[PDB]
Write an enzyme that holds these catalytic residues in place. Structure first.
Site, mmCIF file in Angstrom:
data_model
loop_
_atom_site.group_PDB
_atom_site.id
_atom_site.type_symbol
_atom_site.label_atom_id
_atom_site.label_comp_id
_atom_site.label_asym_id
_atom_site.label_seq_id
_atom_site.Cartn_x
_atom_site.Cartn_y
_atom_site.Cartn_z
ATOM 1 C CB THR A 6 -0.951 0.027 1.204
ATOM 2 O OG1 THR A 6 -1.878 -1.050 1.065
ATOM 3 C CG2 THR A 6 -1.700 1.336 1.328
ATOM 4 C CD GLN A 7 2.885 2.883 -4.423
ATOM 5 O OE1 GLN A 7 3.663 1.938 -4.320
ATOM 6 N NE2 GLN A 7 2.980 3.776 -5.396
#
Lengths: 140, 233
Positions: free
Chosen positions: B1-2
């Site tokens: 996740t970013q």
């Protein structure tokens, strides 16, 4: 006694590695290949023995490219040469990925050098049965 | 996740009788700040494919490096690298499509929406979309982010279905794309006046146009607007 030539990494009493010198015989047995350094580049050429009329002309290519700027040609065991160029390509990709610039020819040379030398350090591997002529154009 | 940091906006595209057109502005937005103005978001691969990328620019630069490697790796032990066994738009797309879906499936996506525009070896127009989820689709017109909402409606007036493609010329198609870019400059707050445009024709080949500007803008009517309702001066 004797038996100094039965194992790869073994030193003979005269400080030689016979398994490496036996690999040279496999190279000497092979086709002839050259390289000529001109004023602003390099030229590679190789002999392709036509075993029979059944060989499709211009198809069984021997000279291999590394990255887009390096040429590699070899004499001896062709599979061993292919294995070295496969490594060279992984090695050039690794360099470009970290440093952005395409691998310099001296830098690339030592990369092949250290890998081939590594196959003379252990009895669990065989030395390379090829002498490789390679090069290209870089920064300087 | 970013989370995406430096971002590029809409990529718009359509197919005409002989080839495909794709365009994207030259901006790298840092949230509301219009930080970088010399950003190319159309990546040519060979002479038959242009990859237009929107979203995170750091992930775009990664995909750009992956494509230059795909060219290098294809040339290896390939005497037909500039002929029969050259990279096809469909080959380049399916690779990117495979990567995007693998990255979403590892919960570490490439924060991008990509359009692969090009012409196949048999002269067929190739145009297909892929995003951070690995979702893929083809249509006579494709557009990413804001383009999907404003560009598509305008480009679909020129090519509504498949049968309209052979009736559309390069002049009509390009004019529609150049108009759509101006409309995006009017209403998209993360857009730029300066854009790049690439045409891949099955005859004239690849035409890459740099430093294009949105021209013929209607602003004159603004002088007549005063207050927000009841104000007369």
């Amino acid at each position: 006694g004797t038996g100094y030539d039965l194992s790869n990494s073994v030193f003979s009493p005269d400080g030689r590695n016979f398994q490496v010198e036996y690999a040279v015989k496999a190279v000497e047995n092979g086709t002839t290949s050259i390289g000529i350094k001109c004023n602003d580049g390099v030229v590679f050429a190789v002999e392709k023995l036509i075993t029979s009329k059944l060989l499709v002309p211009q198809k069984n290519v021997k000279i291999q490219v590394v990255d887009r700027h390096i040429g590699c040609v070899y004499s001896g065991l062709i599979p061993d040469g292919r294995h070295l160029v496969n490594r060279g390509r992984e090695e050039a990709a690794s360099f470009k990925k970290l440093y952005k610039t395409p691998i310099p020819i001296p830098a690339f040379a030592d990369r092949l050098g250290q890998y081939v030398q590594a196959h003379t350090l252990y009895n669990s591997v065989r030395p390379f049965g090829v002498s490789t002529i390679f090069g290209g154009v870089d920064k300087n | 996740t970013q989370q995406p940091i430096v971002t590029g906006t809409s990529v718009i595209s359509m197919k005409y009788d002989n080839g495909v057109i794709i365009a994207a502005d030259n901006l790298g937005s840092y949230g509301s700040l219009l930080r970088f103005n010399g950003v190319e978001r159309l990546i040519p691969v060979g002479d038959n494919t242009v990859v237009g990328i929107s979203g995170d620019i750091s992930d775009m630069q990664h995909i750009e490096r992956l494509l230059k490697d795909l060219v290098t790796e294809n040339a290896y032990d390939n005497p037909l690298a500039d002929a029969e066994e050259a990279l096809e738009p469909s080959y380049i797309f399916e690779y990117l499509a495979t990567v995007m879906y693998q990255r979403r499936s590892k919960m570490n996506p490439l924060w991008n929406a990509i359009i692969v525009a090009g012409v196949q070896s048999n002269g067929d127009q190739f145009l297909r979309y892929v995003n951070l989820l690995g979702v893929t689709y083809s249509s006579p017109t494709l557009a990413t982010g804001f383009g999907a909402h404003m560009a598509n409606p305008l480009l679909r007036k020129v090519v509504d279905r498949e049968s309209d493609i052979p009736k559309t010329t390069v002049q009509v198609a390009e004019e529609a794309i150049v108009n759509a870019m101006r409309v995006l400059y009017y209403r998209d707050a993360r857009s730029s006046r300066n854009f790049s445009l690439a045409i891949i024709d099955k005859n004239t080949g690849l035409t890459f146009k740099k430093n294009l500007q949105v021209e013929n803008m209607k602003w004159d009517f603004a002088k007549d607007i005063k207050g927000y309702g009841t104000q007369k001066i």
